[PDB]
Amino acid sequence: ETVCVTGASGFIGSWLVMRLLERGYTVRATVRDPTNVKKVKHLLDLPKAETHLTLWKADLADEGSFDEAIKGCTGVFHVATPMDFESKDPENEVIKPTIEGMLGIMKSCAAAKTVRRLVFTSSAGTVNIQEHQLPVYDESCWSDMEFCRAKKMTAWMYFVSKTLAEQAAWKYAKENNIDFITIIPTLVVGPFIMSSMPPSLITALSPITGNEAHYSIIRQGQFVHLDDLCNAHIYLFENPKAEGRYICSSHDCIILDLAKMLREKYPEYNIPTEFKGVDENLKSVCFSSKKLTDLGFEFKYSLEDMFTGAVDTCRAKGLLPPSH
Ligand SMILES: NC(=O)c1ccc[n+]([C@@H]2O[C@H](COP(=O)([O-])OP(=O)(O)OC[C@H]3O[C@@H](n4cnc5c(N)ncnc54)[C@H](OP(=O)(O)O)[C@@H]3O)[C@@H](O)[C@H]2O)c1
Ligand SMILES: O=C1C[C@@H](c2ccc(O)c(O)c2)Oc2cc(O)cc(O)c21
Numbered sequence: 001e002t003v004c005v006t007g008a009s010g011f012i013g014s015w016l017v018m019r020l021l022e023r024g025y026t027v028r029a030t031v032r033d034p035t036n037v038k039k040v041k042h043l044l045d046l047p048k049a050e051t052h053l054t055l056w057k058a059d060l061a062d063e064g065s066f067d068e069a070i071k072g073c074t075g076v077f078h079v080a081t082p083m084d085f086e087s088k089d090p091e092n093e094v095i096k097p098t099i100e101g102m103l104g105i106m107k108s109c110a111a112a113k114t115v116r117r118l119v120f121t122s123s124a125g126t127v128n129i130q131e132h133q134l135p136v137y138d139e140s141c142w143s144d145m146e147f148c149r150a151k152k153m154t155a156w157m158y159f160v161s162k163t164l165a166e167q168a169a170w171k172y173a174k175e176n177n178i179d180f181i182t183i184i185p186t187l188v189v190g191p192f193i194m195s196s197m198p199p200s201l202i203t204a205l206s207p208i209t210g211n212e213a214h215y216s217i218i219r220q221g222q223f224v225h226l227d228d229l230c231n232a233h234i235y236l237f238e239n240p241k242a243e244g245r246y247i248c249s250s251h252d253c254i255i256l257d258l259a260k261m262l263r264e265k266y267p268e269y270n271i272p273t274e275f276k277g278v279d280e281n282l283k284s285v286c287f288s289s290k291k292l293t294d295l296g297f298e299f300k301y302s303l304e305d306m307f308t309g310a311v312d313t314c315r316a317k318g319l320l321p322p323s324h
Contacts, residue, residue: 002026003237004073006058006066006105007080009039011198012121012188016077016230021048023234028069030058030080042193060101070108070115075237078105079121082161083199090157098161099168106172106180117179119237122166124186124222124249124287125159133220136286139184139245142167154216181236183229186249186287187218190226190301191309197319201310205320207259208269208311215255219278220285222252225301225309235297242295249287250299251306256280265308268323 003020007013008029020027031039034055043053056069060080070076080101082094102120109115128134129143131151143163148156166182173180189204204223206214229248236242255275263271289299314320 001074002028002072003075003077004028004030004056004066004069005077005079006030007078008043008055009036009194010079011192011194011200012185012226012229013079014042014193015226016079016233017043017053018046018193019227019230019234021046021052025052027053028056028073029053030056030066030069032057032059038195042195046193060097060104063100063104064108066105066108067111070105071112072114073112074114074116076105076109076115076118077121077233077237078102078118081121083158085155085158087157090160094157095161095164099165102165102169103172106169106176106178110176110178117181117237118173119233120166120169120180120182121233122182122184122245123159123162124184124247125155126163126166127184127247127287128285129153129159129163133283133285135283136288137247138288139247139291154213181242182245183232183236184245184247184249184287185224185229186222186247186252187224188226188229189223189306189310191313192226195317197314201314204307204310205314207255207262207271208266208320210270210272215275218258219255219275220252220282221255221258222249222285222287223303223306224248224250225299225306228299228301231300232292232297235295236292239295244291246292247287247289248292249289250301251303252284252286253303254278254282254284256282257284261303262307265304266311270324 008017009031058065087093127141128137129148188200203214203217232248
C-alpha cells in the first residue's frame, strides 16, 4: 500500500521511510526543497527507492501544499515540524505553521477519501511541561501552557507549538470522525542516515559537547531508540485495535546517570562529573509506555545501544570530534 511521510529528510522521517520501504510499502516522501542534495541523496540511495519512493515538494506554511501527495494514500505519517528553538518571531515562524500545517494535513486527508489512518508524531513536551514533575507520566497528562510561556525554558516555543497542534488535531478528529493516532516520543537517540546533526542529538550528546542550555531537557531525562520509535509508528498504523495517544519511551534516568554511562563508554571525551542543581537524590521521572506494550509492541534496544549508535554515527560523519 501507499503511504505519505512528511518531513522525510529528517532524523525520524528518513529512518521511517527506510523501514517502510523495507516492509514493502510504496512511500510518498515530502520535503521542502528537493534540489537540496544533502537532504535527498540519503533517501534516493535507499533500497527500493527507484521503484517505490517518490518525492513531493511541500511546506507547512503553504495552505493545501500536501493535497497532491496525500490523494491516493492509504495512510499518512505526519513527522515534519518547524525545529528552531532560537527563533526571534516564535508565534509566526514556529507556533502558527505547526498548528495550521497540522490542520491542513488533516483536511488534505479528509479531502483525499483514501486515507484510512493518520499517525501524528507528537512530543513528550506536550506531556510533562509543568512546574512540579510527577514520578510517572501517562497519556492522560498534558503540558501547562501558562507555565511554559512564562518560564521560557530551552525549547519552550517548540513545546507550545506541539502541544497546541496536538490538542487542535484531536478536536478536528473527534468532530469529523477521522481515524487519528498520535505517538509521543521522548528523547530520540540512535544511529541515523541523514548527513547533518539531528536536533535531538544536540540535546542527547550535550554532556559531551558541553551544551549546557540543553541540560534542562535531560536533567530528568527519558529516551527511546530511533529504530524502536519507527517500528512503533508502523505498528500503530497497522494495528486496528490502536486508538488515541501513545507514549513511546523505553528508558529514564537523571543527567548524572547518563553522564556516568558516557564517561565509562567514552573516556576520550570531557564529560562532567557534577551538574549544578542536581544531586543523587533527584527523582528519576518516567514516561510509561504501558498502553503501547499492552497492545503487543516490544522495545528491542537499550540505553547503551542508543548512545553508542548516536556517537558512532556522529563520528563516522565528522559531526563529533574523535576525542577531546
Ligand atoms: N527526535 C526527537 O528526540 C523527537 C522527540 C519527540 C518528538 N519528535 C517529533 O518528531 C518529528 C521529527 O523530528 P526529527 O528529530 O526528525 O526532526 P528533524 O530532523 O528536524 O526533522 C524535521 C523535518 O521537518 C521538516 N520541516 C521543517 N519545517 C518544515 C516546514 N515548515 N514545512 C514542511 N516541512 C518542514 C524538515 O524537512 P526539510 O527541511 O527537508 O523540508 C525536517 O527534515 C517532529 O514532529 C518532532 O516534533 C522528535
Ligand atoms: O521532541 C523532543 C522531546 C523533548 C523532550 C524529551 C523528554 C521530556 O521529558 C520532555 O519534556 C521533552 O526533547 C527534545 C529535545 C530536542 O533537542 C529535540 C526534540 O525534538 C525534543
